[PDB]
Amino acid sequence: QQTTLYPLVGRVFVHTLEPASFLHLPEHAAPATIPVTYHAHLQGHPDLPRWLRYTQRSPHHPGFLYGAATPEDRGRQVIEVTAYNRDSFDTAGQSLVLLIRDPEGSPLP
Amino acid sequence: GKSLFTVDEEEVVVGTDRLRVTGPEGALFEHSVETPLVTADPFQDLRLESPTRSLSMDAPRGVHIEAHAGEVEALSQMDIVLHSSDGTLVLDAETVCLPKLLQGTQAASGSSQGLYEICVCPDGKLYLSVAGAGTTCQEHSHICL
Amino acid sequence: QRPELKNHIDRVDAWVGTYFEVKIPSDTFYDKEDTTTDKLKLTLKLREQQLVGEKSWVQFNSNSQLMYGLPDSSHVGKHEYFMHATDKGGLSAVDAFEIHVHKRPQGDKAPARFKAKFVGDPAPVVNDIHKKIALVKKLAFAFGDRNCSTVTLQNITRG
Amino acid sequence: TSITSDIGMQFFDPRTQNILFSTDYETHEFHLPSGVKSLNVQKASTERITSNATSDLNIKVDGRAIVRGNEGVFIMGKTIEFHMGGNMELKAENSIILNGTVMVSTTRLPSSSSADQLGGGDWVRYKLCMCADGTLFKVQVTGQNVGCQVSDNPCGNTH
Amino acid sequence: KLLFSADDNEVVVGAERLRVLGAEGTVFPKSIETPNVRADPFKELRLESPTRALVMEAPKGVEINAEAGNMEATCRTELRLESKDGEIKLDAAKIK
């Protein structure tokens, strides 16, 4: 399972994360009850690059991957992310594909 | 002709399998470190100190602390929580020592309610029965199966 | 209720022969019954909950809620201490902190070197950290200075 | 191919006039080379140790492992084992908490058979009893019909 | 004092300190042999596996010490305290 996103240099990028399709094991009845954390890193690396970071208020709340693309990180980027359920101990490896490209239109001085 | 150590304007290639830095100051790894193994030189202790913050040990498949020829020492200045959420707790030892229990005085009068006694199922399951003048474990053998 | 903690003390930067003094922040600890650090008893302790000795190079006054000290080169490097916050409810919240003591950065190449010989044995003066801090603040006042840390004693010899 | 001097080895590519390698460490900072399999450094400041998504971390050591949590340790896992050779020591200051549906090794723990006709008759032995607030307490047994009812509660009055 | 060597096994650099840049981390495919792992000041220490098991061994003893904290042994299947020929004790004023 992979998903391709299209970030651009200059503005923020944020990814809301839902355990419904991110996790290979479906959460039936009320899905908001189950607490799941997420650990995202560069493929073959322990941590995200400087421009990108990750936060989570509570395990019973969705996490957030967010950051501003840099002109020095332009091109193809690979994110290996693991959905660590705080309860179910279920590993859900996932790949995200990022294409950092130049912004289109007038700049914002 | 096997390369062993090379430098250039591009990188610094080390073709060997070890890189020892003898400086007494040590390393400074500005973020997390990926490895399948951490150890020390033979006949040398290893301390994992957290001198100013807390520490965690997390494994989705499980953690197995081993001292096959030694002992596990676990003293804490505060409360210790053996929090099995909904699972079991098997305690496999020849001897269990509980020298720091509060001493109770048997009397006909009851200080309050909620008093119980500890009862053992034949398979090792532990439960409680209502405290009385005599034993009540034998009267409450429904849970044992 | 038991008091709670929000902010820690990361580390304390000190230098040999230099007097340091730190006042605890007012938001260091919280309690539902007190809500302020100043209205709550604060103590400093060692690893096994022993207080600082009178002769120790770092002391701390509870009424002034102020820690202070002056280290020596035999105590260069790391050290650990605990801050204990006890309320009127008899319950203690704990924070830990680490202190780094460094050598004097100027070292040996100082453009000035003041030297003086006094009267009387230097054994009680060296053995007493109170005498040492009194001497440092007295030089600071002799220059009229406020920050007594501007003095760095480098060496005392019995004569 | 030995070399010897006061300062040491040097090398700089003349097409950049940048010292690509030197051995006067105080001047030029050392950097980690590429392609390194292992490194044996005598002191490490590591924020986090983690494996990759395939195999298991192994904190293996011929020496002793002393992990110390200044603000506390939290072990999270599915199957959590403690295989010690000798005794296992669990010491606390305030209290211990064993929260869960506890089992026990019945075969491993000895059981007192009734073949002997009161060999420990009228002997000072204590029975474990359950307080209302989870606390446990031992009551000395005098006769065959000593229960867990107490008047002077060591659990404290159930406030 | 030896300040550099590079022979058939390994390369020793006698630098006073080893200082790596980069916030993305690093990868050491074989091992790290460090006598003392210390946390960064004002920073946590974390010993975790992303998806797999963690095994740690010390034949001459393990001291887990919380000099002011708790031992939150949070499991879900088994908190096995298996001693070969020793014993278990719970040194605390109260037992819950």
Ligand SMILES: *[C@@H]1O[C@H](CO)[C@@H](O[C@@H]2O[C@H](CO)[C@@H](O[C@@H]3O[C@H](CO)[C@@H](O)[C@H](O)[C@@H]3O)[C@H](O)[C@H]2NC(C)=O)[C@H](O)[C@H]1NC(C)=O
């Ligand atoms: C958005 O805000 C974040 C957070 O302030 C910015 O990230 C920060 O970027 C600066 C410079 O790019 C980083 O400073 C660098 O720190 C390293 C040490 O890690 C140091 O060696 C360098 O010399 C430099 O000082 C800073 O670490 C970094 N912080 C984080 C949390 O990533 C980001 O640049 C901002 N982006 C935009 C478009 O405004």
Ligand SMILES: *[C@@H]1O[C@H](CO)[C@@H](O[C@@H]2O[C@H](CO)[C@@H](O[C@@H]3O[C@H](CO)[C@@H](O)[C@H](O)[C@@H]3O)[C@H](O)[C@H]2NC(C)=O)[C@H](O)[C@H]1NC(C)=O
């Ligand atoms: C080390 O020697 C320096 C001398 O350079 C001492 O610093 C000096 O401290 C005095 C205060 O007692 C400063 O006097 C200044 O007077 C002007 C007059 O207008 C006023 O504007 C200032 O606010 C201040 O009162 C003096 O400038 C200052 N010298 C400096 C900054 O170069 C220092 O106290 C000595 N430290 C010791 C002996 O530990």
Ligand SMILES: *[C@@H]1O[C@H](CO)[C@@H](O[C@@H]2O[C@H](CO)[C@@H](O[C@@H]3O[C@H](CO)[C@@H](O)[C@H](O)[C@@H]3O)[C@H](O)[C@H]2NC(C)=O)[C@H](O)[C@H]1NC(C)=O
């Ligand atoms: C600062 O004061 C100290 C102590 O008064 C001075 O250090 C002392 O230096 C003398 C001269 O070498 C040492 O005497 C001899 O030292 C050797 C070892 O170096 C020892 O084997 C001999 O038995 C004899 O003691 C003395 O030990 C040493 N004291 C120490 C190190 O505590 C120092 O010279 C003074 N510095 C300045 C700038 O005034």
Ligand SMILES: *[C@@H]1O[C@H](CO)[C@@H](O[C@@H]2O[C@H](CO)[C@@H](O[C@@H]3O[C@H](CO)[C@@H](O)[C@H](O)[C@@H]3O)[C@H](O)[C@H]2NC(C)=O)[C@H](O)[C@H]1NC(C)=O
């Ligand atoms: C994730 O970590 C595991 C555990 O270290 C890695 O598996 C191991 O990778 C190393 C280096 O790639 C292998 O070493 C070499 O393997 C070849 C054949 O596989 C062998 O002929 C050489 O003599 C040498 O031993 C090691 O065998 C391998 N072990 C296992 C059980 O797979 C894995 O490569 C890591 N993956 C990533 C993406 O980092």
Ligand SMILES: *[C@@H]1O[C@H](CO)[C@@H](O)[C@H](O)[C@H]1NC(C)=O
């Ligand atoms: C006193 O000296 C210290 C140097 O340690 C400096 O930080 C402080 O600002 C000085 N005091 C004043 C009032 O400038």
